[PDB]
């Protein structure tokens, strides 16, 4: 499965079979440090955090809102009823209830925009689940950083959090590159991969990790003559079926 | 009507490489209000009085440093995706292709492109900047200024944090890792290609052989530098381009003046005016009157407040789809339709 | 500069206050004009910390309507700013200011001011037949937080407003479809989160079962 993940990003999956050892250390070394990132840094969980810590904050602040006057003689509805009859009363009365009614209808409508906040983000991280978990993703940076080749989802309190394994290319090394090669005065253009150049031979290797092969007529195709390429450069194309016969 | 039948099929003889704008809003200018200012400028019986309420312009102070924090949270995800300030070569030999019209031009001293000048001049801000101060605004009394006038009534602009020569400095590296680099800058290290090579790589991505761009460069860096050059005219001459750009700037404007122009309400009491109040009655009935004021001035804040929270999350919504369309169209190459503009991506 | 007419004493703006008026002795139209002005912003580490702090005064051009000024001036696009003293180096943004400029708590220590870093600085090696291809691999695992649901709550309207006064509740009682509304929405938001919650988790309905022989080619779960 990891090697058709590999075939998925664009690697051959000889390169997973030959380097399996490594490729699992690598993945069991990176899951293990993501314990240690996690309980090192105290604002991982920032996000649910602030959602419970904003709750908590809006409710705290609708049971503070309850000692505003909203001009009226006290914001106790018990020490107006103690001083004062039934109609002077109503008066104070129907102004603490406006005042109560408008925290509340504040209290509903930050809670509307919040939840409407929340659904995007619930939308995103099932989208996420679909795409990242259920499947392979070839969209750039939505399942985390390098070709995605897949992820795991944990549930967190409030939220989810996905662990996005990636395939991150290393130690790189500088080629000189052909658009094409000339052999016998046709145009080889190779059929995965590209030309490169070591300075003295050429060599026919895959786009993303360092393989280099013989260019043959089974790496190439052939489209017209080397009058039109620009920087087509000369090289011989090595035939296997005539040292067969 | 297209002509359909059992065995017959369409087949292409030709392309052509089409360039298309899609323009996006990012953030929206970043606001903190007064209370105290705004409902009892410079009255103390007014300040005593509003004290009962208190809370409420903590909690709309609280919603609108929420909205400017979250601007610039917006720009940073939508520009910052790269942590590399990439430099593009001295040499722009490209295989005939050619960007200056995209590239920062080093005559100019904010370092913008011709194209991101001819954006920057075609988006008109209601400011020239961010520090008016006490004595210009005293000294042009007879203009009316409408910034002065949301200032004396509690009402300020934030800067962003991000400059628009940073903005064009993180275009810049991005331009010039996808020039240099191709999609590799984006998944990890740059690594250098040819560009002729990595146009390649495009159409084999869109499912054409590589041979078609290598037989057809020099017709197909010409379309390129055509239709870059034609998006520079159609922008030039298109008066209405930059429409939700100026869209988001006017709504802005007009919701701080609308703020200013909402103080002149009696809200049921006798006057508008605290003064005149104030110099009419004693503290009791003056009481009353501004009592009624507070609750009419607060409820304008409370719902400037409230549509610029929502006004907001829209914006945040185009700031995701922005920087979900960097990663996706510049960082990468997208199979997703239309996602990444009109035609084969 | 005004010029009253001669049956005009006060002259008023969009706002309705009182901008101008007639000396009634002198004849003279004067303007008025409030004094208070301008945003200022406080910069602060933690108060556990330290007790400086930098005031930052939005629409002060320095090069004064403050406080009081200290040895530490600068002046920045985003205002004046008076306790910090500016550096020449770059840093990572730690408390943000506003146009390019940040603070931060260095080291015999004080509030600093710089100008943000937006990275390091790299230079692509382009040529026209050069290719960069990588030798090795690394496997990377990342995190991605994201909420899916926040806390649901209901009110009671009588009580949160008329908590057990029953004349209290009975002039409440002229109101009602308003405490019906906002429990619709409260109602909705708590719905909206459960759907949210099934949406993300419960993508697949058959609950599969890990072997219990845990031998994945070396890969550990
Ligand atoms: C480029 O690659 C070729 C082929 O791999 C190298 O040629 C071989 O070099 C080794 C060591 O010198 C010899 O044992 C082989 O006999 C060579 N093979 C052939 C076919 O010549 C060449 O040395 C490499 N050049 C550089 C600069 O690395
Ligand atoms: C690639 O090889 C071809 C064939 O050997 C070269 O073409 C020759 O060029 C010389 C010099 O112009 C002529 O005198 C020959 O008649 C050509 N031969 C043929 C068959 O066309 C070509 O110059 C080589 N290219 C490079 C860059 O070395
Ligand atoms: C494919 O399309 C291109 C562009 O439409 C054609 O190039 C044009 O050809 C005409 C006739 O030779 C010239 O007058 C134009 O100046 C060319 N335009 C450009 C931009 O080069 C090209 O001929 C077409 N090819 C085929 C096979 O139809
Ligand atoms: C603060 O005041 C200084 C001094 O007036 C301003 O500096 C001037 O800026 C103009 C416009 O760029 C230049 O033409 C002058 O040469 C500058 N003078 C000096 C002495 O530097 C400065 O621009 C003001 N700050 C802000 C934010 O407006
Ligand atoms: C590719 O990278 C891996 C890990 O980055 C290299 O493996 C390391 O090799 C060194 C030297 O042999 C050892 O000391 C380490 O213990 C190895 N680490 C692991 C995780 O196996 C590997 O050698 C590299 N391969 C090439 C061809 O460069
Ligand atoms: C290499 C080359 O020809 N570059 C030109 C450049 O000089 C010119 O300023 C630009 C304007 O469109 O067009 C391109
Ligand atoms: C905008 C621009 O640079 N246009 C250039 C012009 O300046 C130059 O004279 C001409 C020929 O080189 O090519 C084009
Ligand atoms: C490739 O060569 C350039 C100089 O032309 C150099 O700066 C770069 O580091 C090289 N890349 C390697 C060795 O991976
Ligand atoms: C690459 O640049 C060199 C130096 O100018 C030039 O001689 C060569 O022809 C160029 N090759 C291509 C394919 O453009
Ligand atoms: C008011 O009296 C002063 C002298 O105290 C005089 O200068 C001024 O002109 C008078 N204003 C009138 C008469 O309008």
Same mark, same amino acid.
């Given at each position: 499965q990891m090697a058709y993940r590999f075939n998925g990003i664009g690697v051959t999956q000889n390169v997973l079979y030959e380097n399996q050892k490594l490729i699992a250390n690598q993945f069991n070394s990176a899951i293990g440090k993501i314990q240690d990132s996690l309980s090192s840094t105290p604002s991982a969980l920032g996000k649910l955090q ?74 995103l991280a099932?989208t996420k689940m679909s795409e990242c978990v259920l499947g392979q993703s070839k969209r750039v940076d939505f399942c985390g950083k390098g070709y995605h080749l897949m992820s795991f989802p944990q549930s967190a309190p409030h939220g989810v959090v996905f662990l996005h394994v990636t395939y991150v290319p290393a130690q790189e090394k500088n080629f ?17 991969g ?11 290797t895959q786009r993303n990790f360092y393989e280099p ?33 | 009507?297209?002509? =359909? ?72 995800e939508?520009?910052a995706q790269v942590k590399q300030?990439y430099?593009?070569?001295? #040499? ?41 101060? =006490? ?42 890792g996808? #020039?240099?680099s191709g999609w590799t800058f984006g998944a990890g290290p740059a690594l250098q ?96 009157? #501004? ?36 990663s996706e169209?510049?960082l990468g ?10 035609? =084969?991506? | ?91 990572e ?26 990275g390091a600085?790299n230079?692509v ?6 290719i960069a291809i990588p030798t090795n691999f690394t496997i990377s695992v990342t995190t991605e937080i994201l909420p899916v ?51 993300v988790f419960?993508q697949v309905?058959?609950?599969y079962k890990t072997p219990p022989i845990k031998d994945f080619g070396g890969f550990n779960f």
């Amino acid at each position: 499965q990891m090697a058709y993940r590999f075939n998925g990003i664009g690697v051959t999956q000889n390169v997973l079979y030959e380097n399996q050892k490594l490729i699992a250390n690598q993945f069991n070394s990176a899951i293990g440090k993501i314990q240690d990132s996690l309980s090192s840094t105290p604002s991982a969980l920032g996000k649910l955090q602030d959602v419970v810590n904003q709750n908590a904050q809006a409710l705290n602040t609708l049971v503070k809102q309850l000692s505003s006057n909203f001009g009226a003689i006290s914001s106790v509805l018990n020490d107006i009823l103690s001083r004062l009859d039934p109609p002077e009363a109503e008066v104070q009365i129907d102004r603490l209830i406006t005042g109560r009614l408008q925290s509340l209808q504040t209290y509903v409508t930050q809670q509307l925009i919040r939840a409407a906040e929340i659904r995007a983000s619930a939308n995103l991280a099932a989208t996420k689940m679909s795409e990242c978990v259920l499947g392979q993703s070839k969209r750039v940076d939505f399942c985390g950083k390098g070709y995605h080749l897949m992820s795991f989802p944990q549930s967190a309190p409030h939220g989810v959090v996905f662990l996005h394994v990636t395939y991150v290319p290393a130690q790189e090394k500088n080629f000189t590159t052909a658009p094409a090669i000339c052999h016998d005065g046709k145009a080889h253009f190779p059929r995965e991969g590209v030309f490169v150049s070591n300075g003295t031979h050429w060599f026919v290797t895959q786009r993303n990790f360092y393989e280099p092969q013989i260019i043959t007529t089974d790496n190439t195709f052939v489209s017209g003559n080397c009058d039109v390429v620009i920087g087509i450069v000369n090289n011989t194309v090595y035939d296997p079926l005539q040292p067969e016969l | 009507s297209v002509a =359909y039948s059992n065995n017959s099929i369409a087949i292409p003889t030709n392309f052509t490489i089409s360039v298309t704008t899609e323009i996006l809003p990012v953030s929206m200018t970043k606001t903190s209000v007064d209370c105290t200012m705004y409902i009892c400028g410079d009255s103390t019986e007014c300040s005593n009085l509003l004290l009962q309420y208190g809370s409420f312009c903590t909690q709309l102070n609280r919603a609108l440093t929420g909205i400017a924090v979250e601007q610039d949270k917006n720009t940073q995800e939508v520009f910052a995706q790269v942590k590399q300030i990439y430099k593009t070569p001295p #040499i722009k030999d490209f295989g005939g292709f050619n960007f200056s019209q995209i590239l920062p031009d080093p005559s100019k001293p904010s370092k913008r492109s011709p194209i991101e000048d001819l954006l920057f001049n075609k988006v008109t801000l209601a400011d020239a900047g961010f520090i008016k101060q =006490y004595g210009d605004c005293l000294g042009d009394i007879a203009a009316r200024d409408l910034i002065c006038a949301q200032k004396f009534n509690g009402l300020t602009v934030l800067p962003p944090l991000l400059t628009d020569e940073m903005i064009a400095q993180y275009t810049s590296a991005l331009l010039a890792g996808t #020039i240099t680099s191709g999609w590799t800058f984006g998944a990890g290290p740059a690594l250098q290609i040819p560009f002729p090579m990595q146009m390649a790589y495009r159409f084999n991505g869109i499912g054409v052989t590589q041979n078609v761009l290598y037989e057809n460069q020099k017709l197909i860096a010409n379309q390129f530098n055509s239709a870059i050059g034609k998006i520079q005219d159609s922008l030039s001459s298109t008066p209405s381009a930059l429409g939700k750009l100026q869209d988001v700037v006017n709504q802005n404007a007009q919701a701080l003046n609308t703020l200013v122009k909402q103080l002149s309400s009696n809200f049921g009491a006798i006057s508008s005016v605290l003064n005149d109040i104030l110099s009419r009655l004693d503290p009791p009935e003056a009481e009353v009157q #501004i009592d009624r004021l507070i609750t009419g001035r607060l409820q304008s804040l409370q719902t400037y407040v409230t549509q610029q929270l929502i006004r907001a999350a829209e914006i945040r919504a185009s700031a995701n789809l922005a920087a979900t369309k960097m990663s996706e169209c510049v960082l990468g190459q997208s199979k997703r339709v239309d996602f990444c503009g009109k035609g =084969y991506h | 500069n005004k010029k009253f007419l001669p049956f005009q004493q006060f002259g008023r703006d969009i706002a309705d206050t009182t901008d101008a008026v007639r000396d009634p002795q002198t004849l003279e139209i004067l303007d008025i004009t409030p004094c208070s002005f301008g945003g200022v912003s406080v910069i602060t580490p933690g108060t556990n910390t330290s007790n400086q702090v930098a005031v930052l005064y939005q629409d002060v051009n320095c090069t004064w309507r403050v406080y009081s000024t200290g040895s530490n001036v600068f002046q920045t696009r985003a205002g004046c700013l008076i306790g910090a003293e500016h550096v020449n180096n770059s840093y990572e943004c730690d408390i943000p200011i506003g146009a390019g400029i940040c603070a931060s708590y260095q080291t015999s220590q004080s509030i600093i001011a710089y100008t943000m870093s937006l990275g390091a600085e790299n230079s692509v090696a382009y040529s026209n037949n050069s290719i960069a291809i990588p030798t090795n691999f690394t496997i990377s695992v990342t995190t991605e937080i994201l909420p899916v649901s926040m806390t649901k709550t209901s009110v009671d309207c009588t009580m949160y407003i008329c908590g057990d006064s029953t004349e209290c509740s009975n002039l409440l009682l002229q109101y009602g479809s308003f405490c019906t509304q906002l429990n619709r929405a409260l109602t909705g938001i708590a719905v909206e989160q459960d759907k949210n919650t099934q949406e993300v988790f419960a993508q697949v309905k058959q609950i599969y079962k890990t072997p219990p022989i845990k031998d994945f080619g070396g890969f550990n779960f």
